[PDB]
Structure formats: C-alpha cells, structure tokens
Design a protein around this ligand. Sequence first.
Ligand SMILES: Nc1ncnc2c1ncn2[C@@H]1O[C@H](COP(=O)(O)OP(=O)(O)O)[C@@H](O)[C@H]1O
Ligand SMILES: Nc1ncnc2c1ncn2[C@@H]1O[C@H](COP(=O)(O)OP(=O)(O)O)[C@@H](O)[C@H]1O
Lengths: 353, 353
Amino acid sequence: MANMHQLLTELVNRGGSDLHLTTNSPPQIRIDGKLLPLDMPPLNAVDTKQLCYSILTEQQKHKFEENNELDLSFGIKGLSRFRGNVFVQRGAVAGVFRVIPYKILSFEELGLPPVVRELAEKPRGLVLVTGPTGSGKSTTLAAIIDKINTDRHEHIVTVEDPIEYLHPHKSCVVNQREVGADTKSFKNALKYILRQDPDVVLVGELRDLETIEAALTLAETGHLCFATLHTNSAVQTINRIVDVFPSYQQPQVRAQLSFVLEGVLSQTLLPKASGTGRVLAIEVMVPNPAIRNLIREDKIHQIYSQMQVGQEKFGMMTMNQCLYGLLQKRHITMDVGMGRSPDPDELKQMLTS
Amino acid sequence: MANMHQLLTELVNRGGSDLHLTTNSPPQIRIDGKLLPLDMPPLNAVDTKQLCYSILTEQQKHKFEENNELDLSFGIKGLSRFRGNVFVQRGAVAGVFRVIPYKILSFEELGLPPVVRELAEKPRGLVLVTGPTGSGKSTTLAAIIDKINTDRHEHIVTVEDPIEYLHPHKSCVVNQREVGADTKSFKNALKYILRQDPDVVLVGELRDLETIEAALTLAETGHLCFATLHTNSAVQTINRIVDVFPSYQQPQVRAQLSFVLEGVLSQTLLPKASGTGRVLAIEVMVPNPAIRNLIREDKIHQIYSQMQVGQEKFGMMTMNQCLYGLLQKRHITMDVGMGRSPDPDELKQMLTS
Ligand SMILES: Nc1ncnc2c1ncn2[C@@H]1O[C@H](COP(=O)(O)OP(=O)(O)O)[C@@H](O)[C@H]1O
Ligand SMILES: Nc1ncnc2c1ncn2[C@@H]1O[C@H](COP(=O)(O)OP(=O)(O)O)[C@@H](O)[C@H]1O
C-alpha cells in the first residue's frame, strides 16, 4: 500500500508506459518499449499479492479470486489515474499497470475524418466503434462523448467495465456507472436506463445477446446508443451482430439493424513510416437507403460494393480506400499497407489507376 | 518388493520418458517411444495401490478415491520432477508417470538448424511448430523462448496445459500460465492477454477457429506469437489454418498469414540407427517474398517447390531433404527414412544421386 504508491509514482516520474509486478523479479517499468528493472529486491508471492490487493476494493478482491482475472481502473490522489490488470501465474499474483490520461484528444489529433464529428451530432441511432483491443476504440469514443458533452444540453449515461475516461459535466449531464460497484451488471444497469431519461448511452462491448437487444432497443426508441465490437470491418461487424442469435430470430435482428444503424467505425493502429508512433487506419460505413435494404434482405456481402461508391455524399470509406490515402501522404510504407489490406489485390488495382 | 523411488530412478537412469504401473504386468518404461518391461515380477492390486499412493498427500488420496481419477505433479529432491496420473481399471489402481526435464537443451543438441536460432530474433509475427504428440514441439519452443529471454528486454507470456519447461527471468519478464490453475482456460487467458502488455505470447495449439483469430490478432498488433498444430508439413500447416474458415473469409485469412507468418517448423522424432535414442527430423519453411506471394495468390501447392531451392539463402529445408542428410550421416535406416517421407520416390532418387 505505502509501497504501491511509491512504485506507481516512480512509473509516472520516469516516463514509463507500463509497470510490471511479478514473482522472482523486481518491479519492472517499460521505457521506450523495453523493460528495465527497478533497483529493488525481487518480489515474492506475498509482495505481489499485497501490492496488487492494496489498490482493490473488497468486491474486486472477491471477483479476482473467483476468476483469477480482473480488469479495473483506480486513482491515486494528486498523481494520476491508472488501468490495472491483475492475473495469476505459477500460483502467484502478477499485475500490469498503465496510465490513463486526464485530457481527451480532439478529432484532428486522432486522425479521425470529418464524418466522425457528424456522427457525434446524430440525434438518434446506433453507432458502433470496432476493432481489436487497443485499436483506439476507447480513445475515439471519448472524443465523441466529449464533443457531445461540449455541444449539447442532453443526458449522457455510460456503463463501463471498468470506467476508463472521466467526463466532468460540460453542457450535458454525464453519469458514469462502473459495473461491479455502481451497478451489479450490464444487464441490471440496462434494465433501468430507459427510466433515467437518457439522450446518449454508452453500453460498452456487444458481449452477449442480452446487451445487443438493449442497445437496439435504446437505438430504436429515439436515443443515440454507442457500443463496441472486436470486428475489423463494417460487413464483418454487422454479421457478428446477426450470427449470435438463433436462426429463427436473425430476421428480426436484421430488420432492427437496418433502421437504427447510423455508423460503423472499424479501426486499427499501424506503424508510422518514420518508425516512431502509430497512425490510425479506419473503415467508415455510413448507411444509405441501399445499404439498409441489403441488411433487411440478408444480403450483407453486397454491402461492401455499396461502400465503394458512397464516398462523396456521406463521408463513407472502405478500409482499402483509407490505406490508399495513407499511402499517398507517405504516412505508412507499402509493405504495411499491403500487409493489412483486407484485399491486397484491390489496393494494388487502386494504385495503378 | 520394489518401491516408487527405485522405479523412478531407473526410469531416469535409462533415459526413459514414461513409467507404467498396472496389474498383471511388470513395471514398464517407455524408451524412445516404445514400452519395455522391467525385470521384475508382475504387479498385483496391492502393489499398484501402494506404489502410486506412496507419492500422494492425504488430500490427493481422498480426491482420487472420490473420482477414480487424479492428475498431479510432484518432485523427488535428489532426482527430477514428475507428472503423475492415477486412475482405476479392472477394479485396481493403475498409474502413469511422465518426466519433466529441468534443463533446456541447446539448438545444436536438439538437432535444430541455425535458421531456428534466427526466429528468436523476429520482432513480431506468427511462428508455428507442428507435429504429432511427443515430436519435440515443446522442447523446440522452450529452446526458442530461452534465447528470447536471454537476449531481449521484453514481456513473454506463455499459456500451457500444463506448464512443462520453467523459464527463470533472465533479461525478459516471463509469466507462465497453467490452464486449469493459473487461468480457467485458453479462451479466458486470451481474453485478457492484450491487456497484459505482452511482447511474446505462446498460445498453444490452434485448437479452433477462435484461437486462430486470436493468434492472427496478436501477430498483427506487433507481437511475436508462437503456436502449435498437429500437421506434418508446412503446406499442411498453412492449409489447415486457412481451410477452417468459411470460403468467403479465406481471402482475408490468406492475406493475413502472408504478412504475419515468420516460420513453420514441422518435426518428427525417429529412432536412431544405432538402437539408442531418437533424432529430430524437421521440415523448415521461412517465408521469403516469393512464398508470401504464393500465399496471397492462393498458390499453396507451389510452396513446396520454393522450399527445394531456398536451401542455401534462407536455411529452408523440406522433410525429404532432412531425411537425406540423416541418411548420409547414418542416423536413420532407409526403412525409417522411407516410412516418413511424404514422397518415397523422391527420396529414393535423391539417394541414388
Ligand atoms: N486515433 C488514434 N490515433 C493515434 N493513436 C491512438 C488513437 N487512438 C488510440 N490511440 C493510442 O492507442 C493506445 C491505446 O488505445 P485504446 O483507447 O486503449 O484502444 P481500445 O479501447 O480499443 O483498447 C493509446 O496509446 C492511444 O494513444
Ligand atoms: N528436438 C528434440 N530432439 C531430440 N529429442 C527431443 C527433442 N524434443 C523432445 N525430445 C525428447 O522427446 C520427448 C517428448 O517430446 P515433447 O517435448 O513432449 O514434444 P510435444 O510437446 O510435441 O509432445 C522429450 O522427453 C525429449 O527427451
């Protein structure tokens, strides 16, 4: 506890990105991508458990002991907030701890096209921000919420496991519920959200069926609902939503999605051509009447063709079209663009044309 | 009357892998893959129970009597560590006991070519070590991991069922997770691995479609991912990964594999011609620009032709080329070499030439 503060302070003071605590090694900090041990004795299982437990609530200790996994965020007064992950290896506790910045970056700093700001102005519907873990999803969502919070006089409710970015009230009323402390579960929080007069709702990952129906219901009843998935493209995202349901109920889900879907953002971070930092590649799908019909008709695989010709009107963009632009601006190398293109032969064709 | 400790000492001393205790047979030890009876009278039910129980705690004895099954590992201080499984057959106790080596062998001692040492230097991507059970896969991976641990300042995470080779921290931080104790399952470990700030991850077998997608994501997000399959050749490895996906998504998977694949090692252990020990036969495919294109163009068949002529530059090597070298050094018989050649007529032509 009194030592855990000192370890996390040293992480901040020395400009490290991640702090590692595990047995038979001293605490180690990642500086410029590479781990460096602190000048301390190696930790034992008593140390790692005491250090990691010193920053947990009783609910988190019981959840950690029930699953041997725990994602969480916590704050240290006067320093910073931190995202921690605690797990078990070779019968002992281990932990990794990252910093959570206080300041939300703008759409421009993040490399987000103007269509993303227009999604933050939608009065209602379902907007999905997808990609793998650490593909920029939380950062993009924080920028969108911060824009809504700055510009609108509405009620934002977020349900998070855990809460990552904090949104102090601006013009909106912003309520943020952390699963396992503020609310028992996503299911329990969503049962009452319509009785809380929301305008904008962040529901997190579309984990299971129960959460998908809540997001579709919120989006169907006139609210703007934000959610994430792990998928890598607009078409793959829509198929993920439909295919989790029983065969008899997939028609209804497809009908609901065609009306309420207002945007799908699929992101991935690629190495910059300079060799330092990462640059955002994003596929943007903004539904037009043609795409909404393809969803209703169970013709999802023909939507990609529609995305190729909807660029000028709605700000839509296939993943290959974004890589083309990153290549002409020399932000990424040809190998990285080809190595990540969902269809390298198409990207080749776009270059010679 | 033989005790447990003398039996386990003989198993180690004779270079055996497994000790078998069951009624109406003498103790038998597996040497070079084949069972051999010890020069002792056959065991009865009193013997098998006394021998297996001699290495159990009181709690372990109780659990065995409740389920008639028990997996465990245990140590003999002056000898070695061991993995035991106790069960019941024909109303009597039976037992199998496996050896867990303490010492990782060098690349030369295992018969791995120098190009395998270079795989430990790869900054990112997917490396596959394939073959049937007990074909040396775990030992090869342990040799690679030890080099990374020695040479890099990065975070290595292994997920194992169970953990075999132990890796004390060297220059890396090494966390080793045993399925069923440290983590609930492979699926659960992989659910949190992206939040654990890893650089190198061992995920075990590409059991199902979901694990392949996890391995491609790790290799795509800047990590070095190691995994195994039960395929027997480089082409069989690439095909089995691609062919599990639906036909409409196989184009993306092939493009991904062409970018992230950094090596495929397909091994098999063959009995030596001398009659003692086993020798490694290995097919090595390291993708070069030509092979990566064959993957993108769906020309997997033609990869075999590239391996036949990529010997001098990149250290590539087909299985038949490896058997030829083992034959000239008289390490294997012609029948053993022929019994494993994927094309016996090709190996014959190489011998007469
Ligand atoms: N648009 C972006 N442009 C550049 N870097 C980004 C962008 N979005 C996120 N990042 C960086 O990626 C890292 C983690 O992103 P994160 O928000 O945790 O993604 P996710 O919520 O999907 O896991 C951070 O260091 C962040 O600065
Ligand atoms: N590269 C190797 N060369 C020679 N013998 C090996 C090699 N790898 C393993 N062995 C021997 O074979 C036995 C079993 O192999 P193992 O490592 O368990 O492969 P797998 O994990 O695929 O089942 C080991 O006890 C070891 O003595």
